[PDB]
From a paper:
NQO1 is a quinone detoxifying flavoenzyme that catalyzes the two-electron reduction of quinones to hydroquinones. NQO1 exists as a homodimer with two tightly-associated flavin adenine dinucleotide (FAD) cofactors that reside at the deepest point of each active site of two monomers of 274 residues. The two active sites reside at opposite ends of the dimer and incorporate residues from each monomer. The normal biological function of NQO1 is to protect cells from the mutagenic, cytotoxic, and carcinogenic effects of natural and synthetic quinones.
The crystal structure of the hNQO1-FAD-E6a complex was determined to a resolution of 2.9 Å with excellent stereochemistry as 93 % of the residues reside in the most favored region of Ramachandran plot. The asymmetric unit of this P212121 crystal form contains seven physiological dimers. The overall structure shows interpretable electron density for most of the polypeptide chain and five bound E6a molecules. The overall structure of each of the seven dimers is nearly identical to holo-hNQO1 except for a few changes in residues at the active site region interacting with E6a and the isoalloxazine ring of FAD. E6a binds in the active site at the same site as the nicotinamide ring of NADH as observed in a previous study. E6a binds with its halogenated naphthoquinone ring (Ring A) stacking against the isoalloxazine ring of FAD with the remainder of the compound interacting with the residues from both subunits of the dimer. Most of the interactions of brominated ring of E6a with FAD are hydrophobic except for a hydrogen bond between O19 of E6a and hydrogen attached to N10 of the central ring of the isoalloxazine moiety and a weak electrostatic interaction of 3.5 Å between O41 of E6a and O3′ of FAD. The brominated ring of E6a sits in a hydrophobic pocket lined by Trp105, Phe106, Phe178′, Tyr126′ and Tyr128′. Of these residues, Tyr128′ participates in a hydrogen bond with O20 of E6a while Tyr126′engages in a weak electrostatic interaction (3.5 Å) with O19 of E6a. The bromine is held by van der Waals and weak electrostatic interactions ranging from 3.5 to 3.8 Å with the main chain of Gly149 and Gly150.
Author numbering:
A (entry chain A), B (entry chain B): 3 to 272
């Protein structure tokens, strides 16, 4: 029912802004309740600081952000801007991340949003890691625009596999917190695209969003395959290790196991 | 003879600050000229904006950061803070990036530093990308500290291969600009390390820096293996494609070619 669009672009004149508006309008049309987070427009502070904890710190002499931020969440003393974003996430069923690819990742303003908003207990638990994480009932999507062509990001392109680039965001940030990660919306070489083709990209994104919730998510190795505790080193179960010995391919981009990475692990489902 | 230490930590009480001081002292002792970039202390602005261009914009109606930033570099009207950092880089032979791992990547403040400082024509060109790029005569190192243990980042750990996490920074940011990327200094689960062991870590980092310049850099596929033109799609040369058909392993993490990733591609040189 509810969706949150997080946008990491400065210009209203950009294709990224167009893609945000396309999504918002498409979803609203299909009966969704759409909430935005235009990070630049919000003049969002992306830097984690002691200013994110409203009152007195627990140990001001040796400030440690994870410890202090959790305490601030639990005691209700987080910075109001963080709290507002946290309330937006709690509410949302679908979370869309609309951004241009910058230095083979998320723009610094989005990275800062994750660091400041995805606080301990709220977003993650060392116990409730990955598929067990807080956002297990939510679904996330990355809608990316790149300057480089798709062939550059193919297995034989100079930049190398796009699946490798996506892994730290999709597994490390999103899946880590519980999210079911849906296929990314990859819009390559947008600067080279003529006007009519751009108008089509938008129509395609809108038609996708008509049934985005019914889609099958990307594959990540289930937490059930690992002995989750410090004594075991959070390693794959010895039984799973044995079962996988006779298997031709790895499980995911990170769990490639020095075997082949299953084709488009981070780009495609099934 | 010149070195630059870029530090992405708020607290002087941190092990990251200790590691910065350790490096600075070690290098200075071995006759190096050491310059710092304590991003938090500098109160560095990590957000790319039109405020990064002091002169008249080319198209203020449709602002495009890459195009305008290059023009500002060439015409000499980039933001003085950006210029100061650019002058530091121009001077440095060795560049050390001291930071805690945050959300499987660089902290937002460092990410913003790359986005705002690594401007087109200064840090890279279309022709001068990867080996045979502007910083080809420089060497870069990542000194990372993590909360999670090394086993979590092993091929069998929950987070998966650390080599996959490193790839977008080491290849995508550093090697893309010509830097020879040296073996990363990975300091795992630093919070759990006892005092005597923490001392040993610092002493080891200092002893490494005694002969850091003479080290062999990490392997990245040379640009000479690819037909770097639009007609060809920036793909590997037909002869390279064929030669690498009978080879068990891929070239790198990103150039895995659907085969096995060579062990510790992004961690070791062998
Ligand atoms: C610091 C930095 C780092 C970067 N790193 C990378 C990298 O690692 N990899 C990479 O591949 N690229 C990289 N890039 C390039 C970047 O990914 C692209 O420039 C970006 O994705 C372009 O998208 P945009 O929203 O800015 O579009 P724009 O360039 O602003 O817009 C594209 C076109 O769409 C048009 N448009 C706008 N609205 C609409 C609409 N409603 N309907 C139709 N057309 C519309 C515009 O008028 C324009 O002609 C980097 C750029 C920067 C600034
Ligand atoms: C937003 C955020 C995201 C994170 N994401 C991740 C993630 O993706 N993966 C991950 O693994 N971790 C993650 N972490 C954890 C983070 O990487 C670590 O907590 C961090 O690396 C700890 O290093 P530190 O510099 O902060 O040292 P500290 O927190 O200060 O601890 C180091 C210890 O060494 C002591 N010490 C200080 N100076 C010296 C000295 N001179 N000699 C000896 N000992 C000294 C200190 O007193 C302390 O006991 C995240 C943390 C944050 C804040
Ligand atoms: O910003 C860019 C970049 C920066 C770092 C790594 C890869 C990249 C890219 O993919 C290239 Br295409 C580059 C941009 C780029 O340099 C550029 C310069 C002048 C006009 C337009 C552009 C772009 O739209 C490009 O996106």
């Amino acid at each position: 029912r509810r969706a949150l669009i997080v946008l990491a672009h400065s210009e209203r004149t950009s294709f990224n802004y167009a893609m945000k508006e396309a999504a918002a309008a498409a979803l609203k049309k299909k009966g969704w309740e759409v909430v935005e987070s235009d990070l630049y427009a919000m003049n969002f502070n992306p830097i984690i600081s002691r200013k994110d904890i409203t009152g007195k710190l627990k140990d001001p002499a040796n400030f440690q952000y994870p410890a202090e931020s959790v305490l601030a969440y639990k005691e209700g003393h987080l910075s109001p801007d963080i709290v507002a974003e946290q309330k937006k996430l709690e509410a949302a069923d679908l979370v869309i991340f609309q951004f241009p690819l910058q230095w083979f990742g998320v723009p610094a303003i989005l990275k800062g949003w994750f660091e400041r908003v995805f606080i301990g207990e709220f977003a993650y638990t060392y116990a409730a890691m990955y598929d067990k994480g807080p956002f297990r009932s939510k679904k996330a999507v990355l809608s990316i625009t790149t300057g480089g062509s798709g062939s550059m990001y193919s297995l034989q392109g100079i930049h190398g596999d796009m699946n490798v680039i996506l892994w730290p965001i999709q597994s490390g940030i999103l899946h880590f917190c519980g999210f079911q990660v849906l296929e990314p919306q990859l819009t390559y070489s947008i600067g080279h695209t003529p006007a009519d083709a751009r108008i089509q990209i938008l129509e395609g994104w809108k038609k996708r969003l008509e049934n985005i919730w019914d889609e099958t998510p990307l594959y990540f190795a289930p937490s059930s395959l690992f002995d989750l505790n410090f004594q075991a080193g959070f390693l794959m179960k010895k039984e799973v290790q044995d079962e996988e010995k006779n298997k031709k391919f790895g499980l995911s981009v990170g769990h490639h196991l020095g075997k082949s990475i299953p084709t488009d692990n981070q780009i495609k489902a099934r």
